[PDB]
Amino acid sequence: TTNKPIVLSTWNFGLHANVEAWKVLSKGGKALDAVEKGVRLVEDDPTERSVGYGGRPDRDGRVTLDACIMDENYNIGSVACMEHIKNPISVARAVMEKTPHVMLVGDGALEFALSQGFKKENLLTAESEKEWKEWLKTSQYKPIVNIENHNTIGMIALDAQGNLSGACTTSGMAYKMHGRVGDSPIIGAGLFVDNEIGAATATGHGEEVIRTVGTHLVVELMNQGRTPQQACKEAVERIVKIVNRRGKNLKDIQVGFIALNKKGEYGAYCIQDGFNFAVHDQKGNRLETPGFALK
Amino acid sequence: TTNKPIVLSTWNFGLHANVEAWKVLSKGGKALDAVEKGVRLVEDDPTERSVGYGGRPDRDGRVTLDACIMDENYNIGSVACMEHIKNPISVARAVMEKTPHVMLVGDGALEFALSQGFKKENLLTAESEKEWKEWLKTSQYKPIVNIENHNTIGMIALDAQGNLSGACTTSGMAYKMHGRVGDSPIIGAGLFVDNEIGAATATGHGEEVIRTVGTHLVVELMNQGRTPQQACKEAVERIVKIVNRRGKNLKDIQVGFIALNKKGEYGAYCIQDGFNFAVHDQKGNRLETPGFALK
Questions:
Q1: Where does substrate bind (chains A, B)?
Q2: Strands B76-82 and B103-105
Q3: FRET partner for B71 with CA separation of 20 to 30 A, picked from A105, A130, A161, B25?
């Protein structure tokens, strides 16, 4: 029994993102193409303020995006703190397929994007500019991650050929310091895929996922025999432990992991209730709610 | 019986870097201060062409540095593709201690550094500029990791209190594309420290260490009961397996690691021969050579 093809994505918008990914997966397409197409839908959406176009800018009014992609054979691509390109996941894929490198950041990422035909566009919408200038009044940095805030999209899929791939794209924490980079474009942090084991992607307070190399841990736990759900659970618990050891309050932190193994089994776990993920397989597309640590 | 204090650092210059770290460690100082002081020695040296001042620029003649630091209590700091600041490891430490973030890149990293009192300096030596303009005549990109090439410095130490910390700083691959980020500033790639387990830092082609989340793997292996030596080797072996899966020739890829556990035991291993690391403990400071896979 292998549940494939199957795609999982973070948060409620992962439901329609999944529909796009399924257009590829249901036709026997590659997982890599499916996750790229899936997350691009959100990058393009001006109303999704935490991914691509319309994403809230850093505290200086700059919309800088981070994204990384990983296919079924350890090929990886990443862009971080890149401006003016609506689809960082696609530039990430170009970094992976067209360069000797796996990660480009800032001006260099943009210059590369432009050299690859991507079009420079203004990603700061009127709404984001308005909210930003308003936030500037008191400049109180307090990133909240909940059902209605900082919903980064991570997507992982197992295609008909039984290959895994994943993509993660975000606009990062709203009003972050200029140049701040989270977990989303870091392989092993926001995303990790090993075709002989499984894949996992993360969302939430990036700093904490970077700190625990979250997705690599989830996949390594699955490598050790943990079910996808259990692997995610333990990774969350590791963050809970570290948050405690660092003298911080868990209520201020939200992280969710979703995972998939080679047999198409899947799971998820998060720190705080309110996190859902969308799962689409041959049975249909559904919004599911994993367990949470903070009770 | 735990062997402490003890410090390990990559390559020949690690011997001198170790002397500086020992000035802190032998006095009962913090591992964090020891590793920062240790690598800063290399950053300051213009003769060290792969770390800070005097580092070979990217293909556009820009010296952009990457660095990260991790202490004994899951605190982390990182800077990537930062220009004009000779001591990125210290800016990374500032990111860790002075901000709500763990990673800043590009202009934002420089702006933060300046806000912290770091001085803007020309890191491009006459020698580097000359070599660069000379390289421009051919523009053939071909990174080599040997005893006198791309010698990034990574350092990990266990102090008198039995606490671990690590630091990694580099100028990255010479003539890399502008904005290229290697493994050095990535937690879990170039460096990873878990005070309950051990620490590890990497050597070799950054892209490959990122791809395999090398140091997190090494530490996790140590967490699974492996000794430092075994962890570095089992990691490298898993990685050799991945390199083959990607249809690449092992001779073109160098990936190695040095590790230390909570008991002061240490180890090192690489895909290829020719790498060396410096170890300093109560027996003194010396250069040792790791086992290697490519026979």
A1: 180-183, 203-206
A2: parallel
A3: A105
Whether residue B74 and residue A216 make contact (CB cut-off 8 A), yes or no, is no
H or E segment to which residue B232 belongs: helix B228-245
Angle (CA) B51 B53 B59, round 5°:
75
Sign of dihedral through CA atoms A83, A84, A88, A91? negative
- Among A58, A76, A177, select the one facing B211 at the smallest CB separation: A76
Structure-determination technique: X-ray
Resolution of the solved structure (Å): 1.9
Q: What is the DSSP letter of B183?
A: S
Give the sheet arrangement for strand A266-270, strand by strand.
A191-194, A198-204, A255-261, A266-270, A291-292
Which residues on adjacent β-strands are paired with residue B166? Answer: B70, B156
Cα distance from A70 to chain B (closest Cα, Å)? 9
Distances (CA, A) of B267 to A119, A131, B40, B141, B260: 49, 52, 24, 32, 7
Pair of tokens at residue B274: 């020719």
The response to whether A203 counts as a known ligand-binding position is yes
Q: Using alpha carbons only, what angle is made at residue B168 by residues B164 and B173, rounded to the nearest 5 degrees?
A: 160
Instruction: Output the CA torsion B256→B261→B266→B267 (10° steps).
Output: -30
- Residue A175 contacts B, CB cutoff 8 Å: no
Could you give phi then psi for residue A284, rounded to 5 degrees? 135, -175
Strands (E), B115-163: 153-158
| Maximum CA extent, chain A | 57
Chain A hits for B186, CB-CB cut-off 8 Å, are 186, 188-189
Contact A65, A171 (CB under 8 A): yes
